[PDB]
From a paper:
In addition to the anti-TNF activity attributed to the N-terminal four cysteine-rich domains (CRDs) homologous to host TNF receptors, CrmB and [name] have anti-chemokine activity attributed to a unique C-terminal extension (∼160 aa), named as the [name] domain (smallpox virus-encoded chemokine receptor). Biochemical analysis revealed that the [name] domain binds a subset of human and mouse CC, CXC and C chemokines, including CCL28, CCL25, CCL20, CXCL12, CXCL13, CXCL14, and XCL1. The identification of other poxvirus genes encoding homologues with the [name] domain indicates that the [name] domain represents a new family of viral CKBPs, which has specific folding to allow its binding with chemokines, either independently or fused with vTNFRs. Here we report the crystal structures of the [name] domain of [name] encoded by an ECTV strain and the complex of it with chemokine CX3CL1.
The crystal structure of the [name] domain (residues S162−D320) was determined at a resolution of 1.57 Å by using single-wavelength anomalous dispersion (SAD) method with a Br-soaked derivative. There are two [name] domains (molecules A and B) in the asymmetric unit, related by a non-symmetrical two-fold axis with an r.m.s.d. of 0.62 Å for all Cα atoms. Although these two monomers bind each other tightly with a buried surface of ∼1160 Å2, the size exclusion chromatography revealed that it is monomeric in solution. Therefore, the [name] dimer in the asymmetric unit is caused by molecular packing and unlikely has any functional significance. The [name] domain monomer adopts a β-sandwich fold, consisting of two parallel β-sheets and the connecting loops. The β-sheet I consists of five anti-parallel strands 1, 5, 6, 10 and 11. The β-sheet II consists of six strands, which can be further divided into two segments (antiparallel strands 2, 3, 4 and 7; antiparallel strands 8 and 9). The β-sheet II outside surface is completely exposed to solvent, whereas the solvent accessibility of β-sheet I outside surface is limited by a long C-terminal loop after strand 11 surrounding the bottom half of β-sheet I. A disulfide bond, C180−C317, further fixes the conformation of this extended loop by connecting it to the 1–2 loop. However, there are several significant differences in the arrangement of certain secondary structure elements, making the [name] [name] domain more compact than vCCI and A41 and also directly affecting its binding with chemokines.
Author numbering: 161 to 320
Amino acid sequence: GSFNSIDVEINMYPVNKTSCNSSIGSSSTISTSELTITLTHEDCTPVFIGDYYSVVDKLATSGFFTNDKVHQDLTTQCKINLEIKCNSGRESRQLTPTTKVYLMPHSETVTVVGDCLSNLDVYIVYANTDAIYSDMDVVAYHTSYILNVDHIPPNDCERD
């Protein structure tokens, strides 16, 4: 079976802004006035439906996730691209994941532009909800020490 769920998490320190704006679509964004996170998902069948950005002091957890009812088309190759853009970032660079052996087909790239973050963690997680929890593919990236964001709720950007 193929994954029917994609979870993207981005944890960041330090952040100075709590207010954000979201626009989901082919190129989904979460942005504050100091950081923009841009996600693409070409040829990935599960559709991204929600996101969040929530802060405790200067620590942020954020992410995008899909509906979990439709399985990936095994005839198309899911490509997840993610870019974290700092306000005055001058040059892009690629992050390298901590593992490269996976159970399911997918490709991903994670890029950061600027050095405004002392800690940046990214997880791209593909799961077949029909399969045991330990069979998920977890693609993990860390620029520094790994942030603990346990128990920070997934508040969305809408202030209405």
